[PDB]
Design a protein around this nucleic acid. Structure first.
Ligand SMILES: [Mg+2]
Ligand SMILES: [Mg+2]
Ligand SMILES: [Mg+2]
Ligand SMILES: [Mg+2]
Ligand SMILES: [Mg+2]
Ligand SMILES: [Mg+2]
Ligand SMILES: [Mg+2]
Ligand SMILES: [Mg+2]
Ligand SMILES: [Mg+2]
Ligand SMILES: [Mg+2]
Ligand SMILES: [Mg+2]
Length: 228
RNA sequence: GGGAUGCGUAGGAUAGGUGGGAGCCUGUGAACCCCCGCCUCCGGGUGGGGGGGAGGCGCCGGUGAAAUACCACCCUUCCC
């Protein structure tokens, strides 16, 4: 069949006609985590926007109240003293334009890139075609470009996530782990939804949150009332 | 309501987008072989019947603008 026995059992646990409250889903989603690791919990929403126009894009970051339950390998590219501000903030890999060469050669061992605006000329032109397609190019809207490198790094290390609608008008984010207590999952989920709504495009017509789902890495989805 | 889509070059090859992902499937039957429906760019994709009887997939690496298992929300175009 299309799914293995493990996944089939999980499918029994969901009412496919029910719209769950966030509180309920918080509990349920933990039951939907039966893979052989501590599964990330995810939220997905179908947005009432035209992804074809940039002025109706939804893109930002939100600090999850309870963090991500995952460490983020952070590479910072900075010039001068900012190089130390970076290291001190806890950056995994630190460097200036010199390390651009490493990435040009194929080095990709990191999850997030942050940089001072003053290296963004080189980063953009040298790394743009490498980091861009990977959604790893530092960017104001992603909160990954700034002179306050240490504050950015700390926010990211503290559980700040980025979200950006895809070309189909959908949007997705990790919001914790199946090991989180349900109340904490619930908080993180709301935090994300709130951040989403704070980025509703003025021009967006009709229901913004057309649908909102919660799920686990390897499990089925649960449809939720975003305002619960 | 149900199901599949998606093929420049390179790449094992028909790579839809994004997000998750370090695991996934498998005596509730792997590889492999035969047959069939639908689709087909004639490569295959996808679903199923029969045989078979324990391995298969991903990661890694490689190619690439992008990387594949698995899962989720969607898109396009299509079927029932
Ligand atoms: Mg194509
Ligand atoms: Mg293509
Ligand atoms: Mg994917
Ligand atoms: Mg990814
Ligand atoms: Mg058999
Ligand atoms: Mg069989
Ligand atoms: Mg024959
Ligand atoms: Mg066929
Ligand atoms: Mg076949
Ligand atoms: Mg048999
Ligand atoms: Mg899922």
């Amino acid at each position: 069949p299309k799914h293995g026995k493990r996944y089939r059992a999980l499918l029994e646990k969901v009412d496919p006609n029910k719209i769950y409250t966030i509180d309920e889903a918080a509990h349920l989603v933990k039951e939907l985590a039966t893979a052989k690791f501590d599964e990330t919990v995810e939220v997905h929403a179908k947005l009432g926007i035209d992804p074809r126009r940039s002025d109706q894009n939804v893109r930002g970051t939100v600090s999850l109240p309870h963090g991500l339950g995952k460490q983020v390998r952070v590479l910072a590219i900075a010039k001068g003293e900012k190089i130390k501000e970076a290291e001190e903030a806890g950056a995994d890999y630190v460097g200036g334009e010199e390390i651009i060469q490493k990435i040009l050669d194929g080095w990709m061992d990191f999850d997030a890139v942050v940089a001072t605006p003053d290296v963004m000329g080189a980063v953009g032109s040298k790394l743009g075609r490498i980091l861009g397609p990977r959604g790893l190019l530092p960017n104001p809207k992603a909160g990954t470009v700034g002179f306050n490198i240490g504050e950015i790094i700390r926010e990211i290390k503290a559980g700040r996530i980025e979200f950006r609608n895809d070309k189909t008008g959908a949007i997705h984010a990790p919001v914790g782990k199946a090991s989180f207590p349900p109340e904490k999952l619930a908080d993180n989920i709301r935090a994300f939804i709130r951040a989403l709504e704070a980025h509703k495009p003025e021009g967006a017509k009709g229901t913004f949150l057309r649908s909102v789902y919660v799920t686990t890495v390897m499990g089925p989805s649960v449809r939720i009332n975003p305002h619960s």
